[PDB]
Ligand binder design. Structure first.
Ligand SMILES: CCCCCCCCCCCCO[C@@H]1O[C@H](CO)[C@@H](O[C@H]2O[C@H](CO)[C@@H](O)[C@H](O)[C@H]2O)[C@H](O)[C@H]1O
Lengths: 31, 54
């Protein structure tokens, strides 16, 4: 069973595995 | 080759798989441990040398 949770844990069968923007602007005003 | 019947030894005869089972999990259970580990190694090792992780 432990060897079965290893392939479950790794998707060896490759059966599984089938947005906020990082750019944030700030306003400071005039020079 | 000649064969004859027996009665004391035919009281509760077992099929070969029941006879293998009567001893496979008790008296010779170390053989089951090693085999469990050989199969477990053939799982981990063959998965790790073929698949791309993630
Ligand atoms: C007594 C009977 C017990 C039966 C089994 C009991 C549960 C044990 C098995 C699950 C244990 C957790 O194992 C987990 O499996 C999931 C599903 O593949 C994996 O899932 C994660 O990785 C895989 C592979 O990149 C991705 O496809 C998936 O989208 C992601 O969520 C986790 O990496 C793993 O941590």
């Amino acid at each position: 069973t432990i060897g079965f949770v290893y392939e479950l844990g790794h998707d060896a069968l490759k059966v599984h595995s089938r947005l906020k923007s990082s750019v944030v602007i700030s306003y400071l005003g005039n020079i | 080759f000649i064969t004859s019947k027996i009665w004391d030894g035919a009281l509760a005869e077992n099929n070969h798989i029941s006879s293998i089972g009567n001893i496979m999990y008790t008296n010779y259970n170390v053989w089951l441990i090693l085999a469990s580990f050989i199969l477990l190694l053939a799982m981990v090792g063959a998965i790790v040398i073929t698949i791309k992780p993630r």
